[PDB]
């Protein structure tokens, strides 16, 4: 079934964080607003509603989340560890890091900006989008990436983690170090 207004109230804390862990909810109403953090870990939710607003961070670790629609506003970070997300939509306003470890993610939006750290660890992604900007640490360990785009920006450390990079960006300014 689907979450109602009264069922929403029974999964909210004092400061306004929605906890849906292991709960049997399949879809959320459109134009959904959360006062604080949102947790949809281990949920059978396969799609996030259009116009979704989260006043905190989105937690979807080891969930069945697959599709996020554009226009979603997230003030905190996005944690989609172990979910079933295959692509990242364009135009997501993310106020924090993006953790996509152990996901079937294949494609990323062009010129994507991550205000925090980025993770593509053990993902089947083949190539990073052109003009990528990362303000934190980039972990690509165990992924299928082997060629970086012509231009990219990482303001922290770059962790190869084991994968072999052959074509480095022509224009790259690094605020940290590169680790294998």
């Amino acid at each position: 079934y689907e979450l109602d207004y009264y069922s929403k109230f029974g999964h909210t804390d004092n400061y306004g964080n929605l906890d849906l862990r292991n709960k049997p909810y399949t879809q959320l109403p459109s134009g959904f607003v959360v006062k604080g953090n949102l947790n949809i870990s281990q949920t059978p939710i396969k799609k996030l509603p259009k116009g979704l607003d989260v006043g905190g961070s989105l937690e979807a670790t080891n969930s069945a989340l697959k599709t996020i629609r554009s226009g979603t506003k997230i003030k905190g970070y996005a944690n989609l560890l172990g979910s079933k997300i295959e692509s990242w939509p364009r135009g997501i306003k993310l106020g924090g890091y993006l953790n996509l470890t152990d996901t079937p993610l294949k494609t990323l939006p062009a010129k994507l900006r991550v205000k925090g750290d980025l993770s593509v660890i053990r993902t089947p992604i083949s190539a990073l989008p052109e003009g990528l900007v990362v303000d934190g640490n980039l972990y690509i360990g165990g992924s299928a990436l082997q060629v970086f785009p012509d231009t990219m920006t990482v303001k922290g450390n770059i962790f190869l983690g084991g994968n072999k990079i052959t074509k480095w960006p022509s224009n790259l300014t690094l605020g940290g170090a590169v680790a294998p």
Partner: protein
């Protein structure tokens, strides 16, 4: 450490500054009885691990008395 899956205990306190529009404040889902049971089990399991360490200590001391 993993958090409990039980829903938080909602209590109607409309005049509290943390009250929502409906007026309910939420409190942790701590169950006293399981904590007391965990307190007993943790203490009992802790003390029986001391006996095994003590038992192995004596065996090593006797193993050292061989050769003397």
């Amino acid at each position: 450490i993993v958090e409990s899956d039980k829903p938080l205990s909602a209590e109607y306190n409309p005049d509290h500054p943390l009250a929502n529009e409906e007026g309910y404040i939420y409190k942790p889902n701590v169950n006293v009885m399981e904590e007391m049971a965990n307190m007993i089990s943790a203490s009992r399991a802790y003390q029986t691990n001391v006996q095994v360490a003590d038992s192995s200590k004596q065996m090593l001391l006797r193993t050292l008395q061989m050769g003397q």
